[PDB]
Each structure stands twice: as structure tokens, then as C-alpha cells.
Amino acid sequence: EVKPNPLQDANLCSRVFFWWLNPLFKIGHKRRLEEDDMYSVLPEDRSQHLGEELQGFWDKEVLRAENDAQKPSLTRAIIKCYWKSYLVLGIFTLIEESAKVIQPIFLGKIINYFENYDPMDSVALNTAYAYATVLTFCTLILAILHHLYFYHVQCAGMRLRVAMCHMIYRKALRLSNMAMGKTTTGQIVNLLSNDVNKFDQVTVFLHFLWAGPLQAIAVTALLWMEIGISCLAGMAVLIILLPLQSCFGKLFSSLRSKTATFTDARIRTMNEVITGIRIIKMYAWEKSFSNLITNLRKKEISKILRSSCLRGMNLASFFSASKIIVFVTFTTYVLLGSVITASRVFVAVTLYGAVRLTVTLFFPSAIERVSEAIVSIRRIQTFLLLDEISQRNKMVHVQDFTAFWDKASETPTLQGLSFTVRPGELLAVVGPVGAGKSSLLSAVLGELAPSHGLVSVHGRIAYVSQQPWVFSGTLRSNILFGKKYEKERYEKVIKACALKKDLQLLEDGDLTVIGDRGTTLSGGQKARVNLARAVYQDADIYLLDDPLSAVDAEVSRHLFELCICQILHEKITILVTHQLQYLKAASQILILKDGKMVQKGTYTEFVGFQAYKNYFRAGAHWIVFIFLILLNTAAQVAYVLQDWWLSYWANKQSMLNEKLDLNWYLGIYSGLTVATVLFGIARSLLVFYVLVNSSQTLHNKMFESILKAPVLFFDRNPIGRILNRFSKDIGHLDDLLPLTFLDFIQTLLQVVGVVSVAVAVIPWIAIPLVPLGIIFIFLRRYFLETSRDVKRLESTTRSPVFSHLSSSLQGLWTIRAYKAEERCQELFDAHQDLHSEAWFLFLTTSRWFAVRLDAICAMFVIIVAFGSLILAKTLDAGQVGLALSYALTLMGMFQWCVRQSAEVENMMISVERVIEYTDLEKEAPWEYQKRPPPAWPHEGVIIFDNVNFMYSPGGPLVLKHLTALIKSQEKVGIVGRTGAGKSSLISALFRLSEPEGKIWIDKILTTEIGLHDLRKKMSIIPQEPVLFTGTMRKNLDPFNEHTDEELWNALQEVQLKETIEDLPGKMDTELAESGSNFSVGQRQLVCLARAILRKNQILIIDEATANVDPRTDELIQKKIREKFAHCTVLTIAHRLNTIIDSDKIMVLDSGRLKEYDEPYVLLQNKESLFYKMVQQLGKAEAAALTETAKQVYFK
């Protein structure tokens, strides 16, 4: 073994305690674990081996299906492969569950001793120790050995999953090209990423499909043997919870779908804000989106709030049920005339505790998980029944060939085809430009096949698609493509590709690994790599698809005019291209049009405590937690006092030699049931209300921060990084954290229930509990540091599996052309192994903790039992039965509590990642107390003085000392290097970061007012316009202040009305996604409407028309020039002609005012930088500009 596996040498005891799969924790306590540390798989779990195993039975099922003339069944195939193995775990399942029923009987007899307690005996005490001894062994079944068994069940699922991953990838490479049309990777990805992941989740439960009924029956048997048919009153309620719990499933599932539409609506809108934040902020449209997001959140939260409450009732059912079904039983047992006797009640109580899980939870889940599995199995079977490529398989000859792309109504892609080519030759193909006719190679490749026609091929085929592609590994590993590194040929061809000269620039060093998904290489350079493979593959047949002509350079001359044009003329090659300057040298050409071979011939034919403190206080007022803690505790007190009351009653019965006062004892007893269910539902609802209300707070406060956040904040943070929070980190605080949190609280008290009962009945048990405490803390400490890191290793190593699948499925035609079946299989098997090593650890490591934990839970029951016998002088008869009835329950819940502790402590990180945003830096307020007058912009005056600006605090200065006046009604253009010229001036004038120096507007110092007070009074048209998914009205006036005739006027100021007035909503036309239905220029026309409505006296225009239809551009100019003659207008130039009409130009190059003058005077100075920038025109058009400038000064 490359990585020796301790199961190979752990003794037969070792796997009971996981004693020896141990050193990995030694390492994990000191170090971050790493991908070599994880042990290799057991040899029998390897992806190839499980593949070959299961493929055999599936083939035999295909044989059965043919011979029996029926559909094959994949479930039958997997069964006959696994069943003779899988049965053995059944026997444990039987013996395990039988003991869960029998502990009650010996528990009875232990209690039975206390009913006939005599001090002057040792034999019954010895008899009791015997029962107490067997009660211990029963616990070691469930508490220790169970953790061996449960692992191997996990492995049957893990084994089954890996086999299916193998057979799937095998089937995919064999998949017909036609089926690929009927398929998409996303199906195979849903299949292999998720739908096959169902196969772990099934095997844990599969035996409950039958073990449940047996268990339930047996409980009814012992119950019939115990309390007679009075138990039928109780069991009926236990059954009713199965349909009822099923009922909740539909309702909350509905409400889940009821909410899904709004999280998308919020998150899709949220996406526009983070995408548009630059343009949003400059328009001062924060308020519009603020209203929307709030009200969608109000619409959304109302559903999730009601849903949580109709889930909160569900949790209290899992808490209080046992107190209901106990209550209806013994009430019946009294009224039908029995006394209550401690043994019989605590026997009955414990049996209900045992059956409850099997019927209330496990069997319900069991039928569910198989139901999800079986549908997945059917579609995988269907996928395994898709058609396959026919694996039947120096020169190529074709004659009379007439096949379609597919036998169909398509016009046949090839007709009249015959040709012959012999070693030493290049064929070519010519047809429509960029046309799919190169699919001819797929017929030569055998990817297509003759409907009728003769085809002959001998020797290997290289293929390159016009699509670039990369396998996994290094570029060299991609180039090697499973062939040996032939240094001499590698050097010769990498030189022939000129590729080493470029590889220093692309991989930055020869032996460098291709980054994720091929990220390192330019696609055009990656296009070279496929050809680099082909030339590296030294092939006998070269089938070349139409190359990326942008590569046409001396690199391509080395590739084409030497390597292809002379060397790879060895044996055969075919090059479909319109590179007729290379194909004029072609030996023969096949010419295709409308599917005809119209002619053929040679070319001459042509987490810290601060998290919890902030998270809870953001809920309801902090005093409410004190009231909440009374509900949490009071419920627990009602739950425990019920069974204590049930015990106390039996004791009073034992004094009787006459009746107990039924209607006092039973009256009170029923009181506690009413008490315990009521507080139970009361608790459950309250906790959700506090936390889901907390989600409401943290959302609003946090969302406020995004809008007040300065634009610099988005220049650092990637778009995804923020939107993920609104999508999924707040996602946790709605769907899942409150529920997971309540369950934890609901259990933690239950563990305190058992413990406090035990120590209150048997006071001296408090002593060993402290050792038990500190061990637990250290173990949780030692484990969780290790386990958290294993979780990361699993989460990482999974993604290559479908990533390899995805690129491989993209790579199909290449991979199959080279017949690289085993190399790709070896690779997919490899990843599945590395993932299997992580999944192997996750299973065993999670388990190790569980057994080294439930050992103490077993230690706990044992101390209660023997402690009870030790103290027998002191113990009251019923009170033994109480403490034992509780203790035997702990063997369940103790593991589940600590599972949830890690899950909440992990998920509480989503609270921290949201608090992070709630106090980011803010711009200066949107409004100041100092306020601009309504008449303010009526001067239209801009002052620049000493203006120094940086795109970030302390960053490079890109405005330097800039001091200038822009006067009323002036029209001035600004130009230079893009990063010196545009975003610098945009941001500083709009206070997107506070400029140094000073800017004044109409003798108002621009720092002195609120930012909406500023930004409302100016308009921007950016280079990239944006339209927001919503009405044309909202894209024009989200404040509804401008009437549709005004809006239509704008729509009639532009030409757009005659292109939108047809739309069904008119002004209320709900746009397509970002209005992609509208032309880019049309989006630009919309911004002008925003200006036309805004009517600002000051207008800043970015270089919008950099890529606009000239007549559309000149239309833009007309309305700009017309309507804003009185306005003061800044324009940034993509090209000088766009601004040559300006009264003046400011030249901002290197961040300095290189020029500020009349452009003609600038051109009158043959030394001016503007003249030099005009000299870059290289054309007499400078004169047309020159006159056009001069025309301004005619009068």
C-alpha cells in the first residue's frame, strides 16, 4: 500500500473499539491534516474493482432481460451482487433490535426485586446482580458493538456508490453521439453529484423496512404480556403520529416551495444591486431598491415565519409524544381497574421509549429514503440502457457515401462521396465558411456511420476540434496525454509549436501544473495545445478541424507551413479550412455544399462568544431570554415530573394493604401531560420567534450597510462574495439555524433530565460524573479539531470527480478519437479513490468519536443499575424504576445532542459572516443638515481647486492638484489615457471617494451637503448603460413623479416609443432580464431619457458611444446637443471626433491637466499634446476636425 491502512493489521478486537485506526488523531492534534495523511482505501473498495464486480451482475441482468423478453431491472442486479453479502448485517440488525426490546424485561426483573425487597437476603440480590449483569451486556450491544456494525452498513452504501460512479463514467465514454444530443452534462451531474449520493443515505435505513414492524409487534407482545390489551390504547396514538408526522411533511414542503420564489426574487434583485452598485449609487436610487428589498423580505419572511411555527409544532411532537402515549395508556390501565405497579409502568414506559424512535422517526425516514433512492435507481438504469458506441472498430478509402448526420428529415450531410488517400498525402475540405460540414471527420472517425456506403480505415486517427480543450494535469501532462515523455520528440515539437517561447509567458516555468479547470492558458493558446497533442500523438491519420485563424503567425507557419505541410504529410492528413493559401498546396480537396460533395480534386480544381452575544440580542429584547429560559426549563420540569409522578403513585400504592384516591392522583397526573405538551409547544414556538425575528433584524441592518457602503468596497470584494451572503449565509438563518438550534436546546435539557434525575435519586452518583465530564470535554476537544479538518478534505477532493467528468464529457470526441479509454478511466478511478480515502476517513473518524463517546453513555447506565443495588437500603421501589427508565433512554439521545453541538457551532459561523457586514464603513450621510436650496443648480457652475483624488485611500493619486473652472452653460470634453481620464473625474465629482483639494458647485463646496442632496442635482450616462428588471416606468421614474406623457415625451425624444409602445404593459412593461431584448444603444437611449426627465442643469456624459451605430450615435448627439444647450455638459472621449465640437478640452494625462483650452487653439499649437493626440489620427480628417473646431469661433 502506498499509504498503509491499519485495518489490514488491526486485530479482530480492534475494529470493535476503533482502537487502532488511532494515530491519525495524534497527527491531527498537532497539525493540519493533509491529503497524503489519509490512509489508502481497502483494496476491495477500488473504483475499478467495484466497477468490474457490479458490471458483471448488470450484464447478467441484461442477459436475463433478453432471454426473458422483459426490461432489465437494475435493482434486481444490485441485489444479486450484494444480497449474499448484505444479509450478514441483517443478522446483526435482528439481534440489535431484539435487544432493544428485551432490556425492558430484565429492567422489569431488576425493579421486580425492589418490589419484594428483603434486607435479610443475598440470593435475590445475587439474582438481581445476574439480571443487572445481563442488563449491562445488553447495553454493550447497542453502545459499543453497534458502532462497528453501523460502519460496515455505511460501507455498503459507500461501496455501492463508488461502483455506480464507475459504471456511469464507463457508460458515458461508451455513449452514442446521438444520445449526447438527448443528454446534457447537468443530468449526469445531477445524477453523479447528487442523485447517486442518495446511495449512502439509503443503506443506513434499509433494514428498518422490516425491522420496524418486527420491533413494533414485539413491543406489543411484551405490552400485551405486561398490561394486557390496555396497551392497545397507547399503541394507537403511537401509530397516529406516523400519518400526522407525514402530514407536516407536505405542509412545510409546500411552504418551502412557497418561499423559494421570493428568495430568488430577492436574490435576483440583490444581484442587480451588487452588479449595478456603481450606477445605482450615482443615480441616488438606493431608496427605490431599499423599498423593494424590504417589502420582498416582508413578503418572504411572513411565509418562513408561519412555516417555522408549523414546523415548531412538529418538534414539540417529538418531545411530548412519549408523555402523551404514556399518559393515555396508564389512564386506561387504572380505569379498567388495575393498580399501578412500579415494574409494570417502568417496563411499559421503557418499551414506548424503544418503539417510539423506530416507528416515529426511523421507519418514516426509511420509506422516504428508499422512495428517493428508487426513482434515482430507475433513471440510472435508464441511463445505463441508453445506446452505446459500436466498439467493433496507413490508408483510408471511402466510396458512394451518402449518410446523414442522423437518419432524419435533415438534408443529407454527405452525398456522392468517394475518395482514396495513401501514405504521403494531405487531403483538404472546402465548404461554407464556419459550417458544420467538418462533421465529415466524425464519419471518418466513425462517430458517424454510413447509412449506405463503403468505408475503410487503418491506423490511428488524431482529431482536433475547433473547440479547445485540456485534460487534467500539467500542460506537459496534457501534451503527454498518456504517452511516454519522449524528450527528443517533445523538444522537437514544442519547438515546432514555438510553444516553449510562449510557455515561459503562460505557465511561467516549464514544469508547472495547469490550474483549476484549465484556468492558466488562454483559449487561443489552449487551441494550440490540442494541435500540440496531435503532433505529439505522431498519428497515422490526421483529421484537422478548421483552426483558429487568429493564431495565424510565424507560430502557425512552424505548425502549418513546415510541420503539417511537410512532416505530418507522413501517412495521411486531412485539413478542413478556408486557409486556401495553405490549401493551395493541398494534394486533394473534397468540396461540400448543401450536403453534396459538389466536386473533388486538388485545389487547382477551384467560534467566539461575541457571535452568540450579537446574534441573540439582535433578536427580541434581552430580558425575553430570561422568560424563554423559564419555558425551556419548565417544560423539562414538566416532562420529568410526570414520570416522577408516575413513580410516586406506585409508591403510595405500595403502602396500601381500600382504594387510592383515583380522581386526585389521576387528576394531577393528567395535569402534567397538559402541562408538558403545552410548555413543549410553547417553548418550540418561542425559540423560532426569537431567532427568526433575529434573522429579520440582521438582514435589515446588514442590508443597510451595503447601500451605505462606499464604492471602493465593491472594487475589492468580488461580486459573488457578497451575493453569496445574501443568498446562503442569511440562507442558514432562515431555513435551518433556528430549527437546528431548537433541536439542540430540546435535547440538551433532555440529557440534563436523565442526569439530574439520576443524581437526585442516587445522590452519590454525582462523584464519578465529573471524571465523565472532563473526559467528555477533552474528547470533544481532541475530536473536533481533527474532524473539522477531515470535513474540508472530503469537501475538496469531491469536486475533481465531476470536474473531471465535466471536462471529459466535453472531451468526448478527442478522448474517443485517441481511444484513451483506459487513461481516462485510470484518472476517473484515481479521483474516486482519493475521494474514497476521504470518505473512508469521514465514516470511520466520525464513528471513532461515537464509540469512544457512547462508551461513557454505557458507563452511565451501568453505574445507575449497580449503584441502585449497592444502595438498596436507601432506594424507594418506584424511584429505581424512574432513574433506570431514564438512563436506558440516554443510549439514544446522547450521541444526537453532540452531533448537533458541532453542527450548530459550525453553522453559527454564518452569524459571524453576517455580523461582519453590519458595521462596514459608510459614506458620509445621504443627506446633511446643511441643505442645498431648490434654486441651487440654476447657476451650473463647477469649481476645481487643488483637486487631488485617488481611487482608494492612500492609493495612487490620479487627480493631482487639479484646479479649474467650468462655467455656466459651457460644453467641454475631457480626454486622455482611460484610467487617468475617466473614472478619476467621474468619482471625484460625484464624491464616490472624498476628493482632496476642493470642488465647489454654484459656489457651494461639494463636501458641505448630503450625498443625495448632491447626486440628485446631476445626471450621468455611463459608458455601459444598465436597465433594471421591472417596468419601463421604474427604469424611468421609480418615484412615479413623472407622468406617462412626460415619459412618452422622453420615449418620443428618443425613437424608442415606436419600439416599446407595442409592449403589453406600456410604461408598465415588465422588462426581460436586464432588458436584453433591447439593443445596447437602446439602453443608451434610456439613460438619455433619465436625463431628459431629471432635467439637471449639470450633466456628466461618459464615453457611451464607443460602440454604437453611427446614425444611432449621431441621433444621440442630436438630442444631446439640442436639449442640453443650456446645460453644462462634460463628455469623455473614446475618440476625439466625438468631442471636437466641445468649446474646450481638459487633457488629464498622467493625472495632470496637460491642456485646458479651445481645441482649435490646441491644434493651432502644433506642439500641443492634443495636436499629438490628433497626430495619432494619421489622416487628413484632422483638417475636417480643424475646420469643425474653427467653425465654433466664426462668431
Is position 977 annotated in a ligand binding site?
yes
Cell of 520: 492558466
Interface with ligand P2E in residues 370-429 (CB under 6 A)? none
| Shortest distance in whole angstroms from residue 26 CB to ligand P2E | 23
Is position 619 annotated in a ligand binding site?
no
Select the span of 804-812, 892-900, 939-947, 962-970 touching ligand P2E (CB under 6 A).
892-900
Tell me if 358 contacts ligand P2E by CB under 6 A.
no
**β-pair partners for 947:** 962
Tell me if 936 contacts ligand P2E by CB under 6 A.
no
Select the span of 37-45, 656-664, 895-903, 927-935 touching ligand P2E (CB under 6 A).
895-903
Q: How far is CA 1062 from CA 1027, 1045, 1074, in A?
A: 18, 16, 19
| Shortest distance in whole angstroms from residue 732 CB to ligand P2E | 19
CA atoms of 401 and 412, how far apart (whole Å): 10
Helices then strands, counting H and E runs in the chain, come out as 42, 19
Is position 790 annotated in a ligand binding site?
no
Give 276 or 892: the residue with its C-beta nearer to ligand P2E.
892
1179: left (phi over 0), alpha (psi -120 to 50) or beta: beta
Main-chain dihedrals φ then ψ at residue 971, nearest 5 degrees? -120, 115
Give 142 or 493: the residue with its C-beta nearer to ligand P2E.
142
Please, what is the angle between helix 363-384 and helix 74-115, to 10°? 170
Select the span of 171-179, 185-193, 648-656, 889-897 touching ligand P2E (CB under 6 A).
889-897
How many residues form the binding site for ligand P2E (CB under 6 A)?
10
Tell me if 895 contacts ligand P2E by CB under 6 A.
yes
Give 72 or 680: the residue with its C-beta nearer to ligand P2E.
680
Give 673 or 787: the residue with its C-beta nearer to ligand P2E.
787
What burial class does residue 769 get, using C-beta atoms within 10 Å of its C-beta: 0-12 exposed, 13-18 middle, 19+ buried?
Answer: middle
Select the span of 156-164, 811-819, 891-899, 1110-1118 touching ligand P2E (CB under 6 A).
891-899
Give 17 or 1028: the residue with its C-beta nearer to ligand P2E.
17
Is position 186 annotated in a ligand binding site?
no
Give yes or no for a contact between 549 and 403, defined as CB atoms under 8 angstroms apart. Answer: no
Tell me if 616 contacts ligand P2E by CB under 6 A.
no
| Shortest distance in whole angstroms from residue 14 CB to ligand P2E | 20
Select the span of 595-603, 621-629, 776-784, 894-902 touching ligand P2E (CB under 6 A).
894-902
What burial class does residue 505 get, using C-beta atoms within 10 Å of its C-beta: 0-12 exposed, 13-18 middle, 19+ buried?
Answer: exposed
Amino acid at 266: R
Tell me if 787 contacts ligand P2E by CB under 6 A.
no
Which residue of 153, 559, 893, 1085 would you call a contact of ligand P2E, by CB under 6 A? 893
Is position 228 annotated in a ligand binding site?
no
Give 185 or 885: the residue with its C-beta nearer to ligand P2E.
885
Is position 437 annotated in a ligand binding site?
yes
Picking from 178, 672, 245, the residue whose alpha carbon sits closest to that of residue 449 is 178
Give yes or no for a contact between 1185 and 1163, defined as CB atoms under 8 angstroms apart. Answer: yes
Main-chain dihedrals φ then ψ at residue 175, nearest 5 degrees? -70, 135
Q: Which residues contact 912 (CB under 8 A, 6 or more apart)?
A: 607, 611
What burial class does residue 1016 get, using C-beta atoms within 10 Å of its C-beta: 0-12 exposed, 13-18 middle, 19+ buried?
Answer: middle
Tell me if 742 contacts ligand P2E by CB under 6 A.
no
| Shortest distance in whole angstroms from residue 90 CB to ligand P2E | 18
CA atoms of 234 and 246, how far apart (whole Å): 19
CA atoms of 527 and 467, how far apart (whole Å): 7
Tell me if 361 contacts ligand P2E by CB under 6 A.
yes
CA atoms of 889 and 879, how far apart (whole Å): 16
Closest residue to ligand P2E: CB criterion: 892
Give 892 or 995: the residue with its C-beta nearer to ligand P2E.
892
- Look-up of cell digits 409546500: 254
| Shortest distance in whole angstroms from residue 743 CB to ligand P2E | 7
| Shortest distance in whole angstroms from residue 664 CB to ligand P2E | 32
Q: Beta strands 425-430 and 588-593: pairing type?
A: parallel
Is position 465 annotated in a ligand binding site?
no
Tell me if 1006 contacts ligand P2E by CB under 6 A.
no
Picking from 815, 842, 841, the residue whose alpha carbon sits closest to that of residue 828 is 815
Across the beta sheet with 588-593, the strand order is 461-464, 541-544, 572-576, 425-430, 588-593, 596-601
Select the span of 23-31, 126-134, 760-768, 887-895 touching ligand P2E (CB under 6 A).
887-895
| Shortest distance in whole angstroms from residue 315 CB to ligand P2E | 9
Select the span of 478-486, 730-738, 893-901, 1185-1193 touching ligand P2E (CB under 6 A).
893-901
Tell me if 158 contacts ligand P2E by CB under 6 A.
no
Give 110 or 893: the residue with its C-beta nearer to ligand P2E.
893
Give 279 or 887: the residue with its C-beta nearer to ligand P2E.
887
| Shortest distance in whole angstroms from residue 77 CB to ligand P2E | 28
CA atoms of 352 and 235, how far apart (whole Å): 8
- Look-up of cell digits 488562454: 522
CA atoms of 579 and 847, how far apart (whole Å): 64
Which residue of 696, 747, 910, 1131 would you call a contact of ligand P2E, by CB under 6 A? 747
Is position 2 annotated in a ligand binding site?
no
Query: Mask 831-850, x = binds ligand P2E (CB under 6 A)?
Result: -------------------x
Tell me if 899 contacts ligand P2E by CB under 6 A.
yes
Picking from 1086, 1095, 1078, the residue whose alpha carbon sits closest to that of residue 1116 is 1086
Is position 181 annotated in a ligand binding site?
no
Which parts of this chain interact with ligand P2E (CB under 6 A)?
357, 361, 747, 750, 850, 892-893, 895-896, 899
Binding-site residues sit at 431-438, 976-983
Known binding residues for ATP = 431-438, 976-983
